[PDB]
Amino acid sequence: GLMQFTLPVRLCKEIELFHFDIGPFENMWPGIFVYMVHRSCGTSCFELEKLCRFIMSVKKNYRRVPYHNWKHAVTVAHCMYAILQNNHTLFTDLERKGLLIACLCHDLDHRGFSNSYLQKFDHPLAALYSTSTMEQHHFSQTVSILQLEGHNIFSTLSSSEYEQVLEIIRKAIIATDLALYFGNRKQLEEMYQTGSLNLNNQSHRDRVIGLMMTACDLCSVTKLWPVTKLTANDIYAEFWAEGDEMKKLGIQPIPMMDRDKKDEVPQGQLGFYNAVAIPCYTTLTQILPPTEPLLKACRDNLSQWEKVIRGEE
Ligand SMILES: Cn1ncc(C(=O)N2CCC2)c1C(=O)Nc1cccc(C(=O)Nc2ccccc2)c1
Ligand SMILES: [Mg+2]
Ligand SMILES: [Zn+2]
């Protein structure tokens, strides 16, 4: 009850900023998360013993892949942490409980392959879940872990509050399917320009939570250049692996994924900041003004990639 987690001074201060890196010490990530839930939710919203056991089962069920790993899980939870803390009064008691858990669980049991590779492989998951393949699995693994003995962190909720929070979590994890991002942003753009956005409409909150989930998931592009640059190496390590596996199926992979087309990466990143990242943090800034530092940091990194192309690094 009276047991507050407390971080060293540099982390106590830098954890509140959007551009925070959780660092290379694996064994501090669980305490960082618990720290964030306590300040974001209350010391009271989870039984410590149950929370910890949930966190360590979640960790166990992420794999040793270059990017879609336990560090990605916690990095994405931190970004959500910063959005919630800078937007104190806009979010319900259940959203704050649901959304940090959603971020932690959002890529559970990822094997480092796109939904496309699963479909072309004819993986059993492609048959069970025809759209948003990995995302329906991720949710499936979240519900499995919650139903382990001593892992039910929502035990003090009523039957109907329990169903609301698992519904927040499901929509949140499904929204991390980038295929769904484009249409979701397009519609939020229109709702904001034609003045029809209304956060009391449940279907409007869903869209807005979806965009936060995209923004948190892409947050490697909102870091200082050295974090952005070195994270990109992990991202492309997965992408080239999937490229190799496409080639094993007798399929020339898209250039993004071909390790022979390493030269075209800087141009590929320009496309990605222009087509996806900048549009994403722009619209998010319009809906939630205090998330502007994500847009700013994203723009800075676009300009670092333009400098890569101009041979200036
Ligand atoms: C940096 N970062 N962080 C996350 C991801 C990411 O996609 N994922 C993490 C699992 C999926 C990336 C990332 O570099 N992607 C990337 C790289 C190269 C090209 C494109 C692209 O699609 N361009 C493009 C799209 C539409 C139209 C025109 C051009 C995208
Ligand atoms: Mg994912
Ligand atoms: Zn992710």
Structure tokens at 272: 């990605």
Helices of type H across the chain: 9-14, 29-40, 48-60, 70-86, 93-105, 115-121, 124-128, 133-146, 159-174, 178-193, 202-217, 225-248, 265-272, 278-287, 292-309
Give the closest residue (by CA) to ligand 1 atom 3. 218
CB burial readout 145-182, b (16+ within 10 A) else e:
bbeeeebbbbeebeeeebebbbebbbbbbbbbbeebbe
Structure tokens at 78: 């931190």
Alpha-carbon distance of 144 to 159, in angstroms, equals 18
Determine how many CB atoms are found less than 10 A away from the CB of residue 290.
15
Angstrom CA distances, 64 to 68, 72, 141, 145, stand at 8, 11, 17, 19
Determine how many CB atoms are found less than 10 A away from the CB of residue 202.
8
Strand, helix or coil for residue 240: helix
What is the Cβ-side half-sphere exposure of residue 128, based on CA atoms within 13 angstroms? 10
**Solving technique:** X-ray
Cβ-based burial of 90 (10 A; exposed 0-12, middle 13-18, buried ≥19): middle
Residue 72 is labelled as binding a ligand: yes
Atom of ligand 1 lying closest to residue 220 CA: 3
CA–CA–CA angle 178, 51, 159 (5° rounding): 80
Structure tokens at 140: 């499936």
Transcribe 216-238 into DSSP letters.
Answer: HHTGGGGS-HHHHHHHHHHHHHH
Alpha-carbon distance of 170 to 3, in angstroms, equals 31
Among 76, 81, 71, CA closest to 41: 81
Longest CA–CA separation in the chain, Å: 60
Structure tokens at 302: 């676009």
Give the closest residue (by CA) to ligand 1 atom 14. 269
Q: Compute φ and ψ for 101, nearest 5 degrees.
A: -60, -50
Structure tokens at 100: 């940090």
Give the closest residue (by CA) to ligand 1 atom 20. 272
Structure tokens at 206: 């869903």
> How many residues does the structure list for the chain?
313
Q: State the residue for tokens 């694996």.
A: 26
Amino acid identity of residue 28, one-letter, is: M
Alpha-carbon distance of 140 to 108, in angstroms, equals 9
115 touches 132 (CB < 8 A):
yes
Which amino acids are annotated catalytic?
A: 68
Q: Compute φ and ψ for 48, nearest 5 degrees.
A: -45, -55
Amino acid identity of residue 264, one-letter, is: E
CA 106 to ligand 2 center in whole angstroms: 6
Mutational test site, ligand 1, from 111, 182, 235, max ligand atoms within 8 Å of CB: 235
CA 228 to ligand 1 center in whole angstroms: 13
Alpha-carbon distance of 39 to 45, in angstroms, equals 11
Determine how many CB atoms are found less than 10 A away from the CB of residue 113.
21
CA–CA–CA angle 105, 107, 108 (5° rounding): 65
Alpha-carbon distance of 232 to 230, in angstroms, equals 5
Nearest-Å Rg of the Cα atoms of the chain is 19
CA 85 to ligand 1 center in whole angstroms: 28
Whose atoms come closest to the Cα of 134: which ligand? 2
Q: Which CATH architecture has domain 28-310?
A: Orthogonal Bundle (1.10)
Structure tokens at 5: 């987690």
Among 94, 111, 105, 91, CA closest to 151: 105
212 touches 184 (CB < 8 A):
no
Alpha-carbon distance of 267 to 229, in angstroms, equals 14
Q: At what angle do helices 202-217 and 178-193 cross, to 10 degrees?
A: 130
The CB-based long-range contact list for 111-118 (8 Å cut-off, 24+ gap) reads: 111/63, 111/65, 112/63, 112/65, 112/66, 112/67, 112/68, 112/238, 112/241, 112/242, 113/238, 113/241, 113/242, 113/245, 114/242, 115/177, 115/179, 117/242, 117/245, 117/246
Q: Residue 109 has what DSSP assignment?
A: T
The CB-based long-range contact list for 157-164 (8 Å cut-off, 24+ gap) reads: 161/94, 164/94
> What are the domain boundaries of the chain?
28-310
Structure tokens at 131: 């759209």
